[PDB]
Amino acid sequence: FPELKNDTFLRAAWGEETDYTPVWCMRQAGRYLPEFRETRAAQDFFSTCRSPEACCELTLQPLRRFPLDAAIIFSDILVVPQALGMEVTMVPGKGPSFPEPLREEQDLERLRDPEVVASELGYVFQAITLTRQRLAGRVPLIGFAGAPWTLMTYMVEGGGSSTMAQAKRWLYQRPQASHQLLRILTDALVPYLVGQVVAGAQALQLFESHAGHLGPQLFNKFALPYIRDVAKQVKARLREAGLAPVPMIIFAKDGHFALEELAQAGYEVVGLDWTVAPKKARECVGKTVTLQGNLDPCALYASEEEIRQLVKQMLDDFGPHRYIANLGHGLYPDMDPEHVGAFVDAVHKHSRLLRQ
Amino acid sequence: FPELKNDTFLRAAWGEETDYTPVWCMRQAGRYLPEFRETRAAQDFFSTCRSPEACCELTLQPLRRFPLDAAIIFSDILVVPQALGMEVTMVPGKGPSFPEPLREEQDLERLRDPEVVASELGYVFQAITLTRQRLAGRVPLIGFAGAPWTLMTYMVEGGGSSTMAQAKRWLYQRPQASHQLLRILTDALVPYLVGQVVAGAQALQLFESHAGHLGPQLFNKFALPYIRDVAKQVKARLREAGLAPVPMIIFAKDGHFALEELAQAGYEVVGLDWTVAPKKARECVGKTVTLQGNLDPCALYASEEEIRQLVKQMLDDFGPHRYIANLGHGLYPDMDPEHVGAFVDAVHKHSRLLRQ
8 A cells, every 4th residue: 555644643543742633524524515415416325335436435525625634434334234134224314224123132133143244344345445545645544333332222223313212221121132232243343343454444433422322330331341342352353464453443422421441441542522521531531542522513603713713722622642633523414614624724723833 | 288298309409318318200290101191192282281180180190109209290391482482293292393493583583572471371380289289298399491502402403303403503603692592581481480489389490401412611601601590580589579499400411511510500409310420420519419310211121120229329329418319311101110119119218228
């Protein structure tokens, strides 16, 4: 692969000093971009995901508009439960649906052996090698997947949910089947993430979006240990293959009560939502791990000058070391690309003016 | 009104010692009760709310099953935006909808003067006087309303929302119209809550369900000051009328980052969700205020013996003083009334065995 030219994002992730604060945005390839809607208008969502040229193109689009310090491959966390044998739809701009969710223990029998999952996900590895080639070393490429508990919520709920009532009902009423499913998910994730790195990914982010529904005790029993197992096994498999490990990011949306444990879970970087004050987050995580985040993405509805001021405040509270700027959640379809450009321009100009 | 016989809940709320930990459940009058579905099968939701006998009956039903230490009047937080002039529906078991949500500043013109709102809500005061009579002093009666920001989210979103994107867009793009609306809401709430106390309510709970969507800075600017204004004005109006103030509870769902401020906002009791460890909550709030909560209501899906153990742990972490037991969120329609009975029985037996 081409030699990496701008490794600021990787340096920050590892905890090293940098000349400026690197920045990227969750869903930087997303519907807020007209050209993203245009290229996606070509096929359906999961068929977009299976075309290496199409994922490559969607990954590069934001980089053409903005000097972001990283690319993240275009894909979906739901490719893993699909590759396990579940049928999925993106029903007419309504979001993800599993028409036949897991509802009882016997439903586990329909899933593939998790060791066959990576071979079902070859199309993502193809998209990753292609993108890493076409990026030609401009910035590092991030790979990703959903964390075990978060994927389990989709598989049992059949899509999004404001309560996760069914999924938490499994934890309380079927804790054994729950552990069995979480382990199937971990055992599928580890070889998929290792494959992403073999295909060319330079950093991995694990997305635990539905953590906040758990309190501390459920989260300690049912999410954290799988989260720890993912990073331990991925790093061990990469070493065994003779490959450099890459930095790993754990993003736990609404996960204020888990931050201290997450800082010990084997991840270089802890990604935060906008609900934790950056100074309190630093306190919970100590000064080993790098922090990523955490601007409310709705702030980008404010005027450019207001965005600049919000970025200045956020940067001042995180401080310059062991920090990667990002939003606290994905960009929304209605957001103005010019305001995304302002956020990116503001992080760069303020972090430098903060150094120089 | 009949002399109150069991005032344990009020004593705990004020911060006094008690012989046991009092307990009630959010949505204790709810669809998990077959007789609640039966009496509600009589008319539509908002017409149930307007019948004093029907609200009285729904309020008493759980008290017939369980020795709860308080009743809460049957009503809905959405009665206030309806009384301000907005049209609302409970469309066939789909939840609240406003078919015509507020979308721009000019939409404010359609709202009533907030000073006329209490006269539109006479039916709730009738339901409260009736219930306080029929309760005949068995336990105290709680009145309630939604907090200003939470009501504003319904009025702008038109119902529930996983992002509150439109409502936060108002905060970022129309901060002045936002403050105007929040003030209209506060100015309607204060006389409605005072009326509830004049009608016989012995305690008030303000429900800030949608707080967690805000980070600390938005919450400090747009929710907290209205929250403070509500309690200050209600207490001043009651004093001026010659009436005893009642204890006031602020419940801020997902509000971990606001707990320290909420403990200073003029409320006797801070109600918590299941996401904050009870020991950390105590730390944030000091040992002045009383804490209420915070059992994950999905725990009630567990077996009776497991519920007992979870209650024992929760009680041990809160400790006996300045504590009212409750769930961290309303009971779900599918919950087993026998498991609610276990939770109530467990709080009583463990808190006593903890004293004796």
